[PDB]
Amino acid sequence: SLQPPPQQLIVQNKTIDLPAVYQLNGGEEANPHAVKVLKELLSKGMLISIGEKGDKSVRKYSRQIPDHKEGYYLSVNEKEIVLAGNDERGTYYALQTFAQLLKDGKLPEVEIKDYPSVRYRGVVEGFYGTPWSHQARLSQLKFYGKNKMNTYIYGPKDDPYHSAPNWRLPYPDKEAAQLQELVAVANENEVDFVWAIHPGQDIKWNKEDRDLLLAKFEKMYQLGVRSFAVFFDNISGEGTNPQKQAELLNYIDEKFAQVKPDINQLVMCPTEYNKSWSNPNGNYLTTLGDKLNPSIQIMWTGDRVISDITRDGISWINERIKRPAYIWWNFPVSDYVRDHLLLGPVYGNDTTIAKEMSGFVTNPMEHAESSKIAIYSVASYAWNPAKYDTWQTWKDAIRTILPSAAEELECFAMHNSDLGPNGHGYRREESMDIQPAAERFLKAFKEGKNYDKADFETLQYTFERMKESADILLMNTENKPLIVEITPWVHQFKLTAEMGEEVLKMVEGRNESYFLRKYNHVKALQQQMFYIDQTSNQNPYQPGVKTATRVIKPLIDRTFATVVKFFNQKFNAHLDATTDYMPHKMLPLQVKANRVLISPEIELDAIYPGENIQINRLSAGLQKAPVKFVRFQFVLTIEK
Amino acid sequence: NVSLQPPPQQLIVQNKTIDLPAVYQLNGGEEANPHAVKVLKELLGMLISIGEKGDKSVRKYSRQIPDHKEGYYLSVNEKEIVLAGNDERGTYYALQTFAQLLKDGKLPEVEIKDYPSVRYRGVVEGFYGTPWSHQARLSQLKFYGKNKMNTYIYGPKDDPYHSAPNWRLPYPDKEAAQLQELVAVANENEVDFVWAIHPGQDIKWNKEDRDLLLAKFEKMYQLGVRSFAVFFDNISGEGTNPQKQAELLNYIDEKFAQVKPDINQLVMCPTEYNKSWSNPNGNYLTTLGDKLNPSIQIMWTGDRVISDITRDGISWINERIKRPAYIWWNFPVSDYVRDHLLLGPVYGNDTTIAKEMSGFVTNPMEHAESSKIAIYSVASYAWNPAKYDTWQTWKDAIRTILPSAAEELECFAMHNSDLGPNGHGYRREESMDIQPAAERFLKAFKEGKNYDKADFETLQYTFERMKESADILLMNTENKPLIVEITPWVHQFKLTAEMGEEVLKMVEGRNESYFLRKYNHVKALQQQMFYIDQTSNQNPYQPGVKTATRVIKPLIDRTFATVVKFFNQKFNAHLDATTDYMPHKMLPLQVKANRVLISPEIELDAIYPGENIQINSAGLQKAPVKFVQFVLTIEK
Ligand SMILES: CC1=N[C@H]2[C@@H](O1)O[C@](F)(CO)[C@@H](O)[C@@H]2O
Ligand SMILES: CC1=N[C@H]2[C@@H](O1)O[C@](F)(CO)[C@@H](O)[C@@H]2O
Ligand SMILES: [Ca+2]
Ligand SMILES: [Ca+2]
Ligand code: NA
Ligand code: NA
């Protein structure tokens, strides 16, 4: 099992032992990064040959080495091992494949000829929210090397030295030193560190700003950076002028990229960066495609801000930019649904269009470890799209990331995949396995027919498995940083499962007293879920923690409200059928941070000092006046 | 169909009820104890007569009023309501009883003659650890009033203005204003605020220290304090001299208590304060008995530091001190088992010995609201010991403290009662309901015999109820302070119940794969419990959080170990059967704060700077350490 799967693989069905005595051939001339991996894997003998084509070590294998950048030939048989790159990166990649072949001190007899289908592959740290930590970025870069991703584009929107206004200023010493270590680690792992700049919100089209931009790039070059990007995404005003962006990019190309001895990628992200944002008959994209120097890459997110790449979609862009688009794929980025983790499989992208793209990069979540699921899958897709297997690669990623609890992580991920409704209109599948038992159960229950015991048991099994998975994940110490990222969702996922269990016990409801016990327990679990949703992940945009939102929570919520109705009809009672706990009383009320709002007479659960009120455009300042009751969008802000 | 706590000495009911009056004439309002009138006026033509023996208002009932301090006569019929105390406190107690009779604007037709069997009843806040907050104390004093406790002895061991060396120093302004408020609220609820001082560890038997002590009592008098105590418990050296203690207390009596216009209680706690800590062949207790002025109370905790009061036990002390002991009952105090909550019923004290005690106070937990279970029960016991009903009063206390979730709190409380092993040798029953089903299930299961299905189901129902109770208590907003206190134990108790369920699924078992899932879930739940035990309640003495320790956890653990053993035999496997999570490898290792020890080679889960090693010492100068009583201290 190899990720990414190689272009060609012949397995012979013999085992070889990794040699106890071995003779290394080419160690002094091969890529030192590759040699390093080899010597770490190891400990007159069997010949091992390592090198790039043209090296004496492997020259005789020239006809086996694919004539492709980053290509390699790998061979293991009873007499020798060959590890031969088309180029230095190819040799390194041969080693990353070799490392996966190796199991319990043993190797299969194999022959591999391999190379990437897409030239640039990797990650753009390009989101809004808390930028990745230094430690997370160091862990990312080694993960990229392992999965043959050759590109990391550094551009966190909330880094003030990447965007406005402090893009003009050189990083302070501490950050500068850390960026320098990132570049060293990137180089060692055969990843191009691409430093991007995002200057467009306040850029002036004059000599001063032009010189300041170049001076900043020069400071980055001194730190070791050899690839560069200028991003004009999500800005307004003069900085959106395509003639001027092209001129600036061409000036960078001619005065910097064609002036330093060793600059690699020069990349730009347009302002009209997906089809829906492209002004019809407006010539923004035709100006870039026509004026931009042919070596400069142009990024593109597809037909929408968030979209999967189609053949019709990529033909539409390429005809305009006159070159193959450099894909900026907006998944698993969650910076517009920050209360959701997006841990499902990578899918939706046409697997036959590798020739139509210059690069394919993924914009990930602010949760770095959790993003490795999709990242590993994108690595797989971009290297060998023709053999890309969505579900197997998802499972492979999970087993790679958390071998000691892969099935528990699979369980958690399967039910934390969808985005919920959103302004981008982008959705993913979730909980599809149990979705037929769910829909069957609910249809039968609601209308008045008997449900199938099997479906009920299926639901029971799932909640049971959810609780097992949550508790095992919380205490897993194999990848602590991943567990730190996901813990709030994990707690919420567990409460979801327990709630499911108690609602199911209500459905059976042996008797009146047992029913009420179950009902009160459920009310308490709803309160607990509210508490997590108000105290975890309290960001300004989508605060809180949602989980299992597509199929499971709605099923539990609907079953609860239905069985409560049935109890009230039967026992002539008046139990509260509401499913989301709300401390305040009044369309449902909502609490977001220090706001209390009616979904587009309120009595708060206490006296708070008020700040202001907004109603639709009406507003009034409250000036800290004590408030418990309010009586007339509809939003109250309070000091909380 | 009336529940009264404490239960009155005498009660006659009629099985007729009368409505509380819309229009009523009040007689005696201006002359009765204002504290009682206020209660009556808040609780609100038909005659209502309120007053003390001697008032014109209660003249008709003078012979019905018991001739006891704090006694009262209370009567309700269709014609009139009578609330007549032998004295001012009595009238107030009449009202506290009246308040409980009142239900939904309705009163039962009743006649009550009542009085306490023990003169002084209440609480000594006399433990080590975090003193009760000011808000907690305000709540307590109000609770004492409702339950006819007339004594609050203030003596937190870790108040530096109470014990050494700063007993000599007057309270700073902030604290003094707080104590002043505590005294006002005490006075309003008919509680004697008794300020104690703990000077004996460094007292000098000279004029300088005697005057500083008297000067401190004078400052407390200016704050409104009118009852006083000197404690000599848990000290060594010259301060343990009984002649000098007696002389000092007598000086306080003669120059201060007998000189002020209105001082009430003067109380001392001896150095020999329980039989085990006394020398039968020494002169200490006989010197106090002979020399101490007869109005001075002497405290006693029983046969041991922690003990219940017996007839033989109190006889032994009374004969030596020449007066009835003022009991200092060491329950529910948990300052020596700080990882446990003690929420069980009050029991074990002889109910026939009221005449042999001048007082009975409870030394509670540092958890003030949680202590109200025992405090309510002590109030009931001390007022009417003849009628003291252990379990009904426990139930009554819980329903009083947490009416919105009484059954849930009962469940939590019944399994959080015992102290576990300790140096004081004091234990309490716990989980007695399910104990026989547990014991049978385990004996059967261990020896390869079939267990009763009913016992298995009893255990399942228990775990299920524990989970309902835990989640409901966590979210309860009726008594937020109680919930704050118990929350870490509530989390640990939920974990316990989940672990039990999963272990029982292992016993049902089904197939290999399902068993393994259950087993892995159990390991995860053990680690979670360890995390709570290492992160919550990290005090220097008994850090962490233990719950359901006497019966429920041992059962879960022993069942886990057994079923793993059988799985290993059946499948030729080597699953780990150990029942507490331990991250360091080695007899169980233990982790307490930054200490790693072998229960009376070690590989830690990481490199740590080492502090020292103790075996039964060598400092480690912060050297990096991963491999090494037997206690390793590290930096954490
Ligand atoms: C090219 C592009 N820039 C924005 C935009 O897409 O949407 C996002 F990708 C998703 O919100 C955002 O993270 C990114 O910074
Ligand atoms: C009279 C007495 N003083 C100590 C002793 O008993 O034990 C305790 F009551 C329990 O350890 C302690 O709280 C108290 O301060
Ligand atoms: Ca070479
Ligand atoms: Ca009077
Ligand atoms: Na103090
Ligand atoms: Na409290």
Explain this structure.
The structure is a homodimer. By secondary structure, chain A is α/β, with parallel strands linked by helices. Chain A folds into three domains: 1-115, Chitobiase, domain 2 (2-Layer Sandwich), CATH 3.30.379; 116-401, TIM Barrel, CATH 3.20.20.80; 402-640, Methane Monooxygenase Hydroxylase, Chain G, domain 1 (Up-down Bundle), CATH 1.20.58. The first copy, chain A, has helices spanning 32-41, 88-101, 134-146, 173-188, 207-222, 242-257, 284-291, 311-321, 372-383, 390-401, 406-414, 435-447, 453-474, 480-508, 512-535, 552-570, and strands spanning 8-17, 22-25, 46-52, 72-76, 80-85, 106-114, 120-125, 151-154, 192-197, 227-231, 266-269, 297-300, 325-329, 357-362, 589-592, 595-598, 602-615, 618-621, 626-630, 634-638. In chain A, strands 7-8-9-10-11-12-13-14 form an eight-stranded parallel barrel, surrounded by four helices. The longest helix of chain A has 29 residues, at 480-508. Chain A is globular, with a radius of gyration of 28 Å. The two termini of chain A are 54 Å apart. Chain A binds chain B through residues 465, 467-468, 471-472, 474-475, 498, 517, 520-521, 524-525, 527-528, 531, and chain B through 465, 467-468, 471-472, 474-475, 498, 517, 520-521, 524-525, 527-528, 531. One sodium ion (NA) binds at residues 159-161, 175 of chain B.
At the first level of CATH, the class of the largest domain in chain A is Alpha Beta
Question: What's the story with the biggest beta sheet of chain A?
Answer: 8 strands, parallel, barrel
Could you please say which CATH topology of the largest domain in chain A applies here?
TIM Barrel
Share of β-strand residues of chain A: 15-25%
Oligomer: homodimer
Number of domains of chain A: 3
Quickly give the CATH architecture of the largest domain in chain A.
Alpha-Beta Barrel
Q: In total, how many beta strands of chain A?
A: 20
Q: Termini of chain A, distance in Å?
A: 54 Å
* Global outline of chain A: globular
